[PDB]
DNA sequence: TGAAAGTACTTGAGTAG
């Protein structure tokens, strides 16, 4: 029943995107894992629920988003499908490839269970379903470790363009005008993502409704259903229509594929949806701070964010850059990209940004130093003569460094023995242990430890030169 | 001080917005941001605005009606 | 050439799935 299932069973089979038919075949033929990556609205429910209807057993789906799981279950119930929501024939395939990825801003999971169920039914369809990007794609090929159904020219329904806030006198007014010359869903950075931006837009006469973590679930469902029937044209969301006149980002997204996913929820039919990106250097540094303190509390995150930064600052087509990022061939796309519509305008804008890049003083200098230095960034073997050698009270003080300082102290003690006739080496071992431990407890940073041991060895040399024995 | 930060008329009806009043010498201006843009607030207009304020709404402003 | 200090006002501004 690769195609004999038809729309009559659930709702679907019409070869939505002709390889959509093969999307069933890619599962029907059992071609291991097929990298299904298509623009939103592609009927992936046909791709990975038809085998769920046709599996000899179960086809457990990894759709973390419980609300998403329940919505899928009920929408398929409207299509008469034996699917059950286990969230909180089908029990609710490695679905939601962004769930196992931090780039799709969905790497917020827990154990296996559903994943464990999938590993149990590996004989049953093992599918992976908009993350086919060498960084992200190989992350799926490594972290998840599975044909690429990535769209050949991604999507030409978005008029990608980048406008810099520094160049614009009134970024709020500029985004209001851009929305005017175009429903709409807008994302941005944290620190009350919705509230302030939505208030400013509403003051601009463009009713923007907030969707934040602190908002009530009743508010969430009200704004969602209002946005469904065009009651509220503009909805602001943090990370949470076939028209979607604007998906502009006031601030940069958390991850490159995160930005792709947040801008990829437009044009269900394929109608143009503009889509614009606003970039700020201060925003770049702030998010660099955030990601660095996140990874501190891993290098792929900073590498991909730098890739995003250079993508927003490169002289070339945005679709070409995403092909470099998503691994596709040359897009060869017509007008609809900022460099495609006007290379000169993009080059002039980047040049203008480069030219315009340049108690309050305390915090200003602190932020400057942090932003300008951030971008610039073993147990004792057998017989180490150190007291509590397995300690790290002094940062970046390697045990080999401790051994070297101890050897400097030990040759100092040997010279003191040759000059003052100390007892022997057997108790000199314990004496060196005590001296090094005292120097350890009297210093905090590594340089301070080196300075203190240098001062102590200078004092030992002074005592040896004086001729008196090195007393306590 | 409490009422300056509200640019939107919530409470009661009149869901419309409130302009920014800027004084240039002897002239007032209602610089409507985007909801034309600048209108020289005529004193007859402010007279019409003020004549509608209820007694409660002016006594709370400190101005006794009588 | 060679007034100046306290209180206004007047603006833009400002953390998660
Ligand atoms: N093969 C098809 N032919 C015609 N309409 C379809 C087809 N497949 C899906 N549709 C409709 O498109 C909707 C999209 O479902 P979904 O699987 O969530 O899309 P997406 O690929 O973006 O995940 C479905 O609810 C379905 O009703």
């Amino acid at each position: 029943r690769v195609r004999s299932t038809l729309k009559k069973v659930f709702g679907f089979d019409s070869f939505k995107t002709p390889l959509q038919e093969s999307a069933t075949m890619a599962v029907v033929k059992g071609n291991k894992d097929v990298f299904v990556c298509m623009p939103t609205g592609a009927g992936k429910s046909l791709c990975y629920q038809l085998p769920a209807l046709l599996a000899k057993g179960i086809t457990i789906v990894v759709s973390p988003l419980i609300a998403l799981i329940q919505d899928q279950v009920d929408h398929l119930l409207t299509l008469k499908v034996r699917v059950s929501s286990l969230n909180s024939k089908i029990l609710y395939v490695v679905d939601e490839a962004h769930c196992v990825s931090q780039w799709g801003h969905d790497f917020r999971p827990d154990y296996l269970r559903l994943g464990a169920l999938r590993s149990r039914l590996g004989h049953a369809p093992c599918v992976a379903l908009a993350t086919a990007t060498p960084q992200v794609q190989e992350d799926v090929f490594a972290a998840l470790h599975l044909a690429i159904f990535k769209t050949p020219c991604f999507r030409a329904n978005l008029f990608y363009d980048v406008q810099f806030k520094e160049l614009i006198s009134d970024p709020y007014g500029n985004l209001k005008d851009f929305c005017l010359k175009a429903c709409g869903i807008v994302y941005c950075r944290t620190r009350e993502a919705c509230e302030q931006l939505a208030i400013e837009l509403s003051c601009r006469g463009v009713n923007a409704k907030a969707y934040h973590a602190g908002l009530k679930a009743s508010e969430r469902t009200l704004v969602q259903n209002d946005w469904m029937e065009e009651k509220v044209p503009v909805i602001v969301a943090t990370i949470s229509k076939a028209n979607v006149r604007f998906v502009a980002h006031w601030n940069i997204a958390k991850s490159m594929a995160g930005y792709y996913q947040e801008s990829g929820r437009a044009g269900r039919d394929g109608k143009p949806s503009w889509c614009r990106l606003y970039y700020s250097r201060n925003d770049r540094d702030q998010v660099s701070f955030l990601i660095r303190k996140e990874v501190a509390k891993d290098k792929a995150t900073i590498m991909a964010f730098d890739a995003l930064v250079t993508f927003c600052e490169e002289l070339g087509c945005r679709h070409a850059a995403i092909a470099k990022y998503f691994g596709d061939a040359l897009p060869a796309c017509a007008k609809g990209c900022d460099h495609c519509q006007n290379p000169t305008a993009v080059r002039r804008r980047l040049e203008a940004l480069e030219r315009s890049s340049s108690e309050a003083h305390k915090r200003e200098w602190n932020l400057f130093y942090q932003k300008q230095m951030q971008l610039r960034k073993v147990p004792p073997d057998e017989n180490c003569p150190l007291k509590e050698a397995s300690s790290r009270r002094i940062p970046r003080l390697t045990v080999k460094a401790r051994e070297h300082c101890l050897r400097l102290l030990e040759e100092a003690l040997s010279s003191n023995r040759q000059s003052t006739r100390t007892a022997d080496e057997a108790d000199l071992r314990a004496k060196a242990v005590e001296l090094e431990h005292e120097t350890f407890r009297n210093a905090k940073v590594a340089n301070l430890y080196k300075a203190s041991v240098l001062k102590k060895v200078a004092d030992i040399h002074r005592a040896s030169k004086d001729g008196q024995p090195y007393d306590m | 001080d409490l009422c300056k930060g509200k640019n939107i008329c919530e409470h009661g009806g009149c869901g419309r917005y409130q302009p920014r009043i800027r004084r240039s010498g002897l002239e007032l201006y209602a610089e409507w941001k985007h909801v034309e843009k600048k209108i020289l607030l005529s004193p007859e207009r402010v007279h019409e605005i003020f004549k509608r304020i209820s007694d409660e709404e002016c006594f709370v402003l400190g101005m006794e009606p009588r």
Side-chain angles (χ1 to χ4, degrees), chain A residues 1-79 81 83-298 300-334 336-347 350 352-354 356-472, chain B:
Chain A
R1 305 201 64 177
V2 40
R3 204 104 297 259
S4 179
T5 320
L6 267 308
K7 329 99 169 301
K8 57 181 177 60
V9 166
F10 21 74
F12 298 145
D13 289 291
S14 180
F15 353 108
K16 207 183 190 182
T17 294
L19 288 321
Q20 238 274 234
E21 163 211 21
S22 78
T24 54
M25 304 174 59
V27 180
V28 157
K29 302 304 177 300
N31 307 120
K32 310 172 284 79
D33 290 72
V34 37
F35 231 109
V36 182
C37 289
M38 292 205 55
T40 307
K44 284 192 306 296
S45 303
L46 181 50
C47 306
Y48 76 99
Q49 276 85 333
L50 173 140
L53 269 310
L54 297 179
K56 311 299 297 181
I58 322 294
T59 322
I60 303 293
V61 167
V62 189
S63 166
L65 310 97
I66 285 191
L68 180 59
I69 281 188
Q70 186 70 211
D71 293 330
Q72 178 271 359
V73 167
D74 62 56
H75 116 84
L76 280 195
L77 287 181
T78 62
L79 298 179
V81 177
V83 52
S84 54
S85 60
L86 191 65
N87 48 10
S88 60
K89 190 65 176 182
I90 316 176
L91 181 62
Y92 257 72
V93 176
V94 207
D95 196 62
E96 301 296 334
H98 61 166
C99 86
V100 79
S101 179
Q102 76 257 224
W103 319 120
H105 58 267
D106 265 71
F107 218 174
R108 15 258 2 127
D110 193 39
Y111 39 43
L112 251 345
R113 240 98 338 262
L114 305 182
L117 285 173
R118 238 261 102 253
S119 60
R120 253 80 60 85
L121 50 104
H123 49 267
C126 183
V127 207
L129 301 90
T131 59
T133 118
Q135 170 62 217
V136 194
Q137 178 179 348
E138 265 63 77
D139 269 60
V140 181
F141 282 149
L144 179 52
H145 212 290
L146 308 185
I148 324 295
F149 278 0
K150 217 293 109 186
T151 331
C153 195
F154 346 106
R155 50 207 315 178
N157 67 326
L158 308 180
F159 190 81
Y160 275 99
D161 57 327
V162 179
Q163 292 294 148
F164 307 109
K165 301 171 59 181
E166 292 77 12
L167 277 64
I168 300 167
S169 59
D170 46 331
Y172 283 149
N174 184 269
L175 73 92
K176 172 258 180 182
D177 298 334
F178 164 72
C179 298
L180 256 297
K181 56 178 62 61
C183 80
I185 173 163
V186 39
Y187 301 98
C188 56
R189 212 196 56 83
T190 60
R191 187 213 65 259
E192 303 294 333
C194 308
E195 285 70 18
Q196 22 78 10
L197 231 300
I199 286 179
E200 296 297 331
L201 253 178
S202 301
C203 292
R204 259 131 284 271
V206 192
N207 43 6
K209 236 53 65 62
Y211 193 102
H212 198 13
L215 298 188
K216 301 91 181 179
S218 60
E219 174 65 26
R220 302 185 198 282
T221 178
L222 283 180
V223 66
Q224 282 288 346
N225 59 65
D226 292 331
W227 177 78
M228 287 302 301
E229 281 76 42
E230 300 100 8
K231 266 65 181 180
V232 45
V234 189
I235 48 166
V236 195
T238 75
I239 74 103
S240 302
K241 193 61 185 60
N243 44 89
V244 209
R245 302 291 79 188
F246 44 91
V247 295
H249 287 260
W250 167 256
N251 293 329
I252 61 192
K254 187 62 177 299
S255 59
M256 215 294 181
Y259 168 84
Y260 165 72
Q261 182 61 29
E262 304 247 271
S263 61
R265 56 180 71 262
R268 306 283 64 69
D269 61 355
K271 198 152 70 72
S273 303
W274 279 259
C275 170
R276 184 181 290 186
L277 176 59
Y278 296 91
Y279 168 75
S280 178
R281 312 287 286 269
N282 306 271
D283 187 16
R284 171 196 58 181
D285 287 79
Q286 183 65 244
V287 188
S288 68
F289 280 149
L290 261 62
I291 63 179
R292 234 49 62 94
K293 67 180 177 58
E294 167 68 23
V295 301
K297 297 187 300 296
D298 297 328
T301 63
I302 169 196
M303 284 177 62
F305 192 79
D306 296 1
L308 205 179
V309 167
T310 188
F311 149 80
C312 198
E313 299 178 351
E314 58 86 21
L315 290 180
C317 168
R318 300 311 175 187
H319 290 80
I322 210 61
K324 201 280 309 180
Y325 189 80
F326 272 63
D328 285 357
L330 285 311
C333 181
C337 10
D338 55 358
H339 193 88
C340 306
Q341 56 90 18
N342 198 333
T344 65
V346 180
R347 294 188 293 100
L350 189 57
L353 177 69
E354 178 268 353
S356 302
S357 61
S358 298
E359 57 281 352
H361 292 275
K362 305 297 182 60
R363 59 198 65 176
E364 190 276 341
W365 170 260
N366 287 283
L367 266 300
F368 175 89
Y369 174 72
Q370 252 60 29
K371 72 191 293 301
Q372 297 307 140
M373 179 156 282
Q374 170 201 10
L375 53 84
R376 269 177 180 82
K377 284 299 184 60
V378 44
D381 44 330
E382 182 258 335
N383 59 330
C384 281
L386 303 172
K387 181 157 293 183
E388 58 174 17
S390 180
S391 61
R392 288 300 306 272
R393 72 173 285 169
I394 299 179
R396 296 185 294 100
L397 188 49
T398 316
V399 179
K400 292 172 289 298
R402 299 186 57 175
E403 295 179 1
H404 206 345
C405 92
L406 184 63
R407 291 203 303 103
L408 265 71
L409 296 181
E410 185 176 359
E411 57 86 18
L413 292 175
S414 300
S415 56
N416 185 268
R417 157 68 177 271
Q418 267 66 89
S419 300
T420 58
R421 311 307 173 185
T422 69
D424 54 77
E425 185 67 23
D427 56 356
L428 263 182
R429 287 285 300 273
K431 186 175 183 178
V433 168
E434 184 70 20
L435 264 58
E436 200 276 347
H437 178 62
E438 187 73 21
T439 321
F440 224 86
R441 288 190 290 100
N442 296 331
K444 299 181 177 181
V445 312
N447 304 90
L448 237 62
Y449 178 83
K450 299 181 178 181
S452 55
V453 304
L454 182 64
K455 181 179 182 179
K456 290 192 61 61
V457 70
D459 297 330
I460 292 180
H461 294 351
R462 294 176 231 267
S464 62
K465 295 303 178 300
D466 293 330
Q468 301 294 336
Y470 184 78
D471 52 354
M472 304 302 179
Chain B
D1 295 330
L2 186 144
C3 201
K4 187 175 58 61
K6 301 193 61 60
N7 198 263
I8 168 69
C9 176
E10 297 284 9
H11 203 253
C14 181
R16 290 190 59 93
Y17 280 83
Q18 305 298 317
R20 144 203 169 99
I21 301 297
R22 176 182 59 94
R23 173 162 163 265
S24 70
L26 275 184
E27 307 173 348
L28 264 58
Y29 285 108
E31 184 178 0
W32 291 89
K33 44 199 310 303
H34 280 136
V35 206
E36 198 183 1
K37 177 178 180 58
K38 294 177 53 179
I39 162 180
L40 180 138
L41 205 53
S42 188
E44 50 197 332
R45 272 313 305 268
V46 65
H47 179 28
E48 188 67 23
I49 307 173
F50 283 168
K51 195 167 55 182
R52 300 190 183 99
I53 303 180
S54 64
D55 293 65
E56 292 77 10
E57 286 165 346
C58 65
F59 167 76
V60 61
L61 292 173
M63 301 182 54
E64 277 282 353
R66 46 133 41 100

